[PDB]
Structure formats: structure tokens, C-alpha cells
């Protein structure tokens, strides 16, 4: 009766590292003196044969899982999503992939990861109240001033100020969907990068002036300190929630425990541990 | 039946109350009808319902929900308390109206917390909020959890700070920081307007209150002297409160997330909550 937890590699929520030679996880420490709590999470390493191996998982969402498990008295085992995706609906009877598909098929009983709460997913699964707010922001070289999604250099684009996101990413899809972002979308389309890592160096390399991406990740990328920086107000806000099936008996208590944790400062401690730089 | 009793509470810019046109008795433009029970005198509880008009961020939310979830409503302003407090084991305010089945739902600047969630169901949060701190520009504090608040008789002279009593903010401080809480009572403010005056004229050093309202107020403070620290502690949201087990909760959640997905929440936020500061 161990709950099967599915997660995904997404820093700083979930770090995934190889085990040491004896198969244990390296003992490490947080920014405050605290020991980093690590769990073994099995999953693929790298077309590919998807050979499953014990790996070390830690971070915001792992700390949360450990708290939840304690609080609600459940045991668990953690694995990484086999296809490496959060989850979208696709066809060829439409079917969810990623963590969404694993939860619905029974391969997982709970999704503990920065899983964006949205209408399409909520039609199928239950989200907890948010354990963390979600939004987009902008990544630029230090010294650049962008106000947010309503800045004239974004609203009225030219090749003098090039902005983009990752091709076919969740952000790209979101932008294509809004007719009011059309003019903004045609500019991005011509400049979108293949991966976040390829977008970010481009910002370092003055090849791309602004990268639009998840806010938590961008502050983290910026935390290197500091040829890069984040600018403006967050936009297109939502939240990250624990995902469960509609008939889960744990769902109300998971949500209540998350509210309790926001209210007593536990979540701020996590913010200080993993997302405050 | 799909004609619903719905309770609200004035709090700009979330719910703003206007006098109705005496020559028409019809609410117009972006307003909707809302009634308020007003006593004839202080001898008895005899009163009359007064026809007024309501508008604001939450009213636009209500109108949209009315359309996509397909219900009509009779909106009234609560007169028994404010947002919600449990007094002698009996909930008052908007929460009380829902708990005691006087209202099918409560719409307004109603903060989701754990104790409320025990007696009502909340929708997904539709505005980010939590607890913030407002000061005059220059004053140094980090946030609620700051030791300048936690041990106010450390630090000389003693910091002067207060909240508006009986809402989620006081409830949080009372539970988390007993010393800070009993120290603040001296500086309790009757309302947000009083508090902002107390700050600007140096009678108060900090005002601890709902983040969404403080941010809005900072955004339009004359001269931009009042600012919010950093930040938000105990991040939660405003939620629509519904009776436990309510048949309306699922469609309301899906519709709110639909609004997020179609960019409409982002639009509403810039419409009602945009600041000049
Ligand atoms: C922290 C983080 C960062 C990114 C880039 C995400 C994403 O692209 C999708 C999703 C998703 O589909 O839920 N979540 C993300 C979470
Ligand atoms: N929004 C708060 C009221 C203001 C506050 O206490 O911060 C509530 O629902 O109680």
C-alpha cells in the first residue's frame, strides 16, 4: 500500500542526480545548515531503451512530499515519468502522455512535481490547492529594462529588441492560443529556440534580448549571479498543484495540509531553502 | 433550481458599492443589482432591504461565472460581520452565510484558509493573496516573520504596527505568534482607510494586511510614499466559498480555470488592479 509517486526532473523543484558508487545518495547541505533530504527515485537515464535505474531526487517538491507523507501517515515510492513529459492530450481516442497519463492509468497514485494547474487537466484529474504560485517572467542581460508583457518593446516588436520562448513548449502553445497575442506571436515564432538552455546562452551571447519562460526557473537560472537578470511583473499566472485521480481518498487532506503549510511558514521555509537566492 | 442566493462584501477594488439611480431603480454599465439590509433604528431589528449596485473585479468574475455555468442570482451584502470569523463556535460574515445556508456561494475578497475550508468548500483560488506588510518608504522590515514584529520589545523604540481585526490576517497572527498578536491589539485599525492615514501621518510604522488589497493601495497612494515590503507570507488566494458538497463547485472551478486559460484573468487583473506607482 505504498502510494506510487510520479515526478519529473525540473530544478529547483526536483533535482535528479546519479547515486554514488555504493548506490547511496551523496550527503549534502542546504543554504541554511540543514541536511538535504534525498529519496531514491527510479527512472530512465537517457530512440532510447529507457533502462530504469535508481537515482537521487531532492528539492522543493521532494521536501513537500516528505512533509505530506509524515503528516498524512502514508508510505510511498518515487519514480521519474517514463516519457519525461508533464502531460498533454494527443491522438492516434485522445490520450494523455507524461505524468497525466501515468496518473490516469494507475502507474502513479499522485503527481508531486511543478504540474501547472489548468482547465484541460482539471477536467480529468483533481488538483490540490496550489503549493506554489506559477507565472511567466522575462530573462535579460543585466541593465535591460522590460516592464512586463505590456512593455511597448514587446507589444510593438522590431528586430531591435528580439524576444522569444522555446518552440512547442507550453509557453509557445499558450501564446499561439490568444488572438490578442497574435502580433506578439509572429515575432516570437521567427526567433524561438529549441531548448531553454539554447535560449538562455543566446541571452548571454546577445543573440536574443529577452527570453520568456517559467518564473521559478528563470530566477534560478539568474541565481548564478549575474550576467543575466529577470525583469517586469509576472504574467499569465496560475499555480502548481499535487495531482490525484478523482476518487482518491487522500485529496481533501492533501489540500488541507498544503494550506496548513502555507499558513504556518513551512512553505516559506521551502522558499528560503530552494527558491530564495 | 438555478436562481442562487449569493453573498458579498464591499472592499475596493474587488467589490465596490454604488447608489442606484433613483429615477429608474436599474443598475447599469458594469454594475449588477445588490441589496443591503438596513435597520430602521437601534430599538429593534426591524429593517428594509435597500437596492444598490455593485461592481469590481469579483463582480466581473461573478458575471462571467453566471454566463458560463448558467445560473441567475440574487446578490446581497452581508450585514452580520465581515469576511468571516468564528465567534463562540459560530461562524459570522460571508463564511457564516454559506455555512448556515443563507447563501449558496460567497463572492468577494474572501481569503482561503484551513479553518474556513473545514466548514465550506472553496473554488480554486482566482486572485493570489496572502499576508503583506505596508510601510512608509524607508522603513526596514522583511515580512511578517521578522523579529521586529515577533519580539517588538526587543528593538528600541517599540515598532508600532497593527491590522484590521477579525479577518484571516489576525487569525493567522493569533495562531502563529502569540506575543506579536497581543502586542498588536493596541494598534488595531477600524478599516484599511484609517490604517493608511495612520501610516502616512507617522502614527503607525507598519500595517499588516491582505496582500491583494495592500498592493492595490500602494499602486495608487498619492505621492507613492506607501509601499509593500519585499512580498507575501502564507500565500493563498481569494476563493469562492460554497456549501460543503455543493453541486456547483466543479463547474465553477472549471470555468475559473477556463478564464485563466483564455487570458481573461490576466486581463481582469490589469483592468482593476493596475497601479501608477
Ligand atoms: C517549474 C516548471 C517549469 C516549466 C518550464 C514547466 C513547463 O514547461 C510545463 C509545466 C507543465 O506542463 O505543468 N510545468 C513547468 C514547471
Ligand atoms: N481577505 C481577508 C480580510 C482582510 C484580512 O484579514 O487580511 C479575509 O478573508 O478574512
**Residue given cell 528560503 in the structure block:** A272
- In this chain, the answer to whether the domains covering A1-133+242-277 and A134-241 adopt an identical fold is yes
Are A130 and A117 in contact, with CB atoms under 8 Å apart? yes
Give every CB contact of residue B216 below 8 A, 6+ residues apart in sequence. B12, B13, B273, B275
Cα within 13 Å of Cα(A26), Cβ side: 10
C-alpha–C-alpha distance, residues B27 and B50, integer Å: 13
Query: Which residues in chain B are immediately followed by a break of C to N over 2.5 Å?
Result: 230
Q: Of all residues in chain B, what percent are helix, strand and coil, respectively (each to 5)?
A: 30, 25, 40
| H helix and E strand count, chain B | 10, 15
- Bridge partners, residue A4, by sequence: A77
Could you tell me if A182 and A229 are in contact, meaning their C-beta atoms sit under 8 angstroms apart?
no
Closest by Cα among A238, A212, A4, A214 to A121: A238
Asked if B124 has any chain A CB less than 8 Å from its own CB, the reply is yes
B104 and B222 within one domain: no
- Regarding whether B167 and B51 lie in a shared domain, the answer is no
Q: What is the CA radius of gyration of chain A?
A: 19
Residues A5 and A112 sit within 8 Å (Cβ to Cβ): yes
Q: Is A70 annotated as a binding residue?
A: no
- B118 in the same domain as B5: yes
Ligand 1 pocket test target in A6, A7, A8, A10 with most atoms within 8 Å of CB: A10
CB B3 within 8 A of CB B73: yes
From chain A residues 217-236, the ones with a CB under 8 A of any chain B CB are: 235-236
- By the CB < 8 Å criterion, does A247 face chain B? no
- The partner residues of A166 in beta bridges, in order of sequence, read A193
Resolution in A: 2.0
Say whether both B114 and B69 belong to one domain: yes
d(CA B14, CA B110): 10
Same domain, B104 and B163: no
CATH architecture of the domain with residue range A134-241: 3-Layer(aba) Sandwich (3.40)
Both B63 and B88 in one domain: the answer is yes
Q: Using CA atoms, how far apart are residues A262 and A258, in angstroms rounded to an integer?
A: 6
Report domain extents, chain A.
1-133+242-277, 134-241
**Is B146 found in the same domain as B110?**
no
Structural domain of B112: 1-129+235-273
Pick the closest to residue B3 from B74, B63, B60 (CA basis). B74
Rg value, chain B, Cα: 19
**Cα B3 versus chain centre, distance:** 25
CA separation (Å) from A121 to A91, A151, A170, A255?
A: 16, 31, 13, 17
CA distance B162 to B179: 13
Q: Both B38 and B81 in a single domain?
A: yes
Assign residue B147 the CATH number of its domain.
Answer: 3.40.190.10
Experimentally, the structure was elucidated by X-ray
Q: How many domains does chain B have?
A: 2
Contact A10/A213 with Cβ under 8 angstroms? Answer: no
Ordered alpha helix ranges (H), B17-92: 57-65
Q: What are the C-alpha distances in Å from B187 to residues B126, B194, B198? A: 31, 11, 10
| CB of residue B11 inside a 6 A radius of ligand 2 | no
B38 and B56 together in one domain: yes
Q: Is B79 annotated as ligand-binding? A: no
C-alpha cell read off for A66: 516528505
CATH 3.30.750.24 describes domain A1-133+242-277: no
Amino acid at each position: 500500500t505504498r502510494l506510487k509517486i510520479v515526478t519529473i526532473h525540473q530544478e529547483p523543484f526536483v533535482y535528479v542526480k546519479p547515486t554514488m558508487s555504493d548506490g547511496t545518495c551523496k550527503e549534502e547541505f542546504t543554504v541554511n545548515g540543514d541536511p538535504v533530504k534525498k529519496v531514491i527515485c527510479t527512472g530512465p537515464n537517457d530512440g532510447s531503451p529507457r533502462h530504469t535505474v535508481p537515482q537521487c531526487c531532492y528539492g522543493f517538491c521532494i521536501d513537500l512530499l516528505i512533509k505530506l507523507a509524515r503528516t498524512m501517515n502514508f508510505t510511498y515510492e518515487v519514480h521519474l515519468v517514463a516519457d519525461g513529459k508533464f502531460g498533454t492530450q494527443e491522438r492516434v481516442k485522445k490520450e494523455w502522455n507524461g505524468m497525466m497519463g501515468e496518473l490516469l492509468s494507475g502507474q502513479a497514485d499522485m503527481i508531486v512535481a511543478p504540474l501547472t494547474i489548468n482547465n484541460e487537466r482539471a477536467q480529468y484529474i483533481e488538483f490540490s490547492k496550489p503549493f506554489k504560485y506559477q507565472g511567466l517572467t522575462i530573462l535579460v542581460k543585466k541593465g535591460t529594462r522590460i516592464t512586463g508583457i505590456n512593455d511597448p518593446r514587446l507589444r510593438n516588436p522590431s528586430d531591435k529588441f528580439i524576444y522569444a520562448t522555446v518552440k512547442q513548449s507550453s509557453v509557445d502553445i499558450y501564446f499561439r492560443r490568444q488572438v490578442e497575442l497574435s502580433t506578439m506571436y509572429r515575432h516570437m515564432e521567427k526567433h524561438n529556440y529549441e531548448s531553454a538552455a539554447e535560449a538562455i546562452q543566446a541571452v548571454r551571447d546577445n543573440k536574443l534580448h529577452a527570453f520568456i519562460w517559467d518564473s521559478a526557473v528563470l530566477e534560478f537560472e539568474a541565481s548564478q549571479k549575474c550576467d543575466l537578470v529577470t525583469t517586469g511583473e509576472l504574467f499569465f499566472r496560475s499555480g502548481f498543484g499535487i495531482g490525484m485521480r478523482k476518487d482518491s481518498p487522500w485529496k481533501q487532506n492533501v489540500s488541507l495540509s498544503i494550506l496548513k503549510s502555507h499558513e504556518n511558514g513551512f512553505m516559506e521555509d521551502l522558499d528560503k531553502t530552494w527558491v530564495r537566492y | 433550481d438555478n436562481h442562487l442566493s449569493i453573498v458579498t462584501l464591499e472592499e475596493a477594488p474587488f467589490v465596490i458599492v454604488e447608489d442606484i439611480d433613483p429615477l429608474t431603480e436599474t443598475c447599469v454599465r458594469n454594475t449588477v443589482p445588490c441589496r443591503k439590509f438596513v435597520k430602521i433604528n437601534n430599538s429593534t431589528n426591524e429593517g428594509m432591504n435597500v437596492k444598490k449596485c455593485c461592481k469590481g473585479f469579483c463582480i466581473d468574475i461573478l458575471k462571467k461565472l453566471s454566463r458560463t455555468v448558467k445560473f441567475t442570482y440574487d446578490l446581497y451584502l452581508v450585514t452580520n460581520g465581515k469576511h468571516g470569523k468564528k465567534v463562540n463556535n459560530v461562524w459570522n460574515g460571508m463564511i457564516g452565510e454559506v455555512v448556515y445556508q443563507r447563501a449558496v456561494m460567497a463572492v468577494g475578497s474572501l481569503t482561503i484558509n484551513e479553518e474556513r475550508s473545514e466548514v465550506v468548500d472553496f473554488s480554486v483560488p482566482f486572485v493570489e493573496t496572502g499576508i503583506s506588510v505596508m510601510v512608509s518608504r524607508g522603513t526596514q522590515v522583511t515580512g511578517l516573520s521578522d523579529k521586529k514584529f515577533q519580539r517588538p520589545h526587543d528593538y528600541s523604540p517599540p515598532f508600532r504596527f497593527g491590522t484590521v481585526p477579525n479577518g484571516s490576517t489576525e487569525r493567522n497572527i493569533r495562531n502563529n505568534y502569540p506575543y506579536m498578536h497581543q502586542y498588536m491589539t493596541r494598534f488595531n485599525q477600524r478599516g484599511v482607510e484609517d490604517a493608511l492615514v495612520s501610516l502616512k501621518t507617522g502614527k503607525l510604522d507598519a500595517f499588516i494586511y491582505d496582500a491583494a488589497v495592500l498592493n492595490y493601495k500602494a499602486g495608487r497612494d498619492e505621492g507613492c510614499k506607501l509601499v509593500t515590503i519585499g512580498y507575501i507570507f502564507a500565500t493563498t488566494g481569494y476563493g469562492i466559498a460554497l456549501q460543503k458538497g455543493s453541486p456547483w463547485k466543479r463547474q465553477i472551478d472549471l470555468a475559473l480555470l477556463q478564464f485563466v486559460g483564455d487570458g481573461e484573468m490576466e486581463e481582469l487583473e490589469t483592468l482593476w488592479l493596475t497601479g501608477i506607482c
